[PDB]
Design a binder for this molecule. Structure first.
Ligand code: CUO
Lengths: 70, 70
């Protein structure tokens, strides 16, 4: 895992508001399950990319990601 | 159900309130005020009476009652 972007820890100064939180909260807002899932799933994707980074065998790749314990 | 949580867990907003509240409490002129509240535990000693020649500190320390008092 090449968490090239350590930047993840760069949250907001207020600290509550975070990108994840903003994204997640919005997802929570929807009543419809389907609508909820689209937002929900995308938020999910971010972690995969952030950890995997550039590395060929990692979280970032669909193929490889299951291998990592994260 | 006011909730007491680990200090670490606390939110910035949660923290925000405590910091402001205590600071305001510090200012509080009232008997309810912080300086006054502090006197409950120890000096100035209030126990025998608020105005009594010999005063003892309010510690039901070394007693069964101790956890209740605190
Ligand atoms: O102070 Cu009297 O007990 Cu912790």
């Amino acid at each position: 895992r090449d968490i090239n972007r350590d930047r993840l820890f760069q949250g907001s100064t207020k600290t509550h508001h975070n990108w994840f939180i903003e994204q997640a909260l919005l997802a929570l807002e929807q009543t419809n399950y389907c609508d909820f899932e689209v937002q929900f799933e995308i938020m999910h994707n971010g972690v995969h990319t952030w950890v995997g980074g550039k590395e060929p065998y990692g979280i970032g790749h669909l193929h490889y990601a299951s291998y990592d314990p994260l | 159900v006011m909730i007491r949580k680990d200090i670490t867990q606390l939110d910035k907003r949660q923290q925000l309130s405590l910091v402001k509240a205590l600071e305001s409490m510090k200012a509080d002129h009232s008997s309810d005020g912080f300086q006054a509240i502090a006197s409950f535990h120890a000096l100035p000693p209030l126990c025998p009476s608020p105005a009594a020649s010999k005063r003892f500190a309010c510690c039901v320390h070394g007693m069964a009652t101790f956890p209740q008092w605190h």
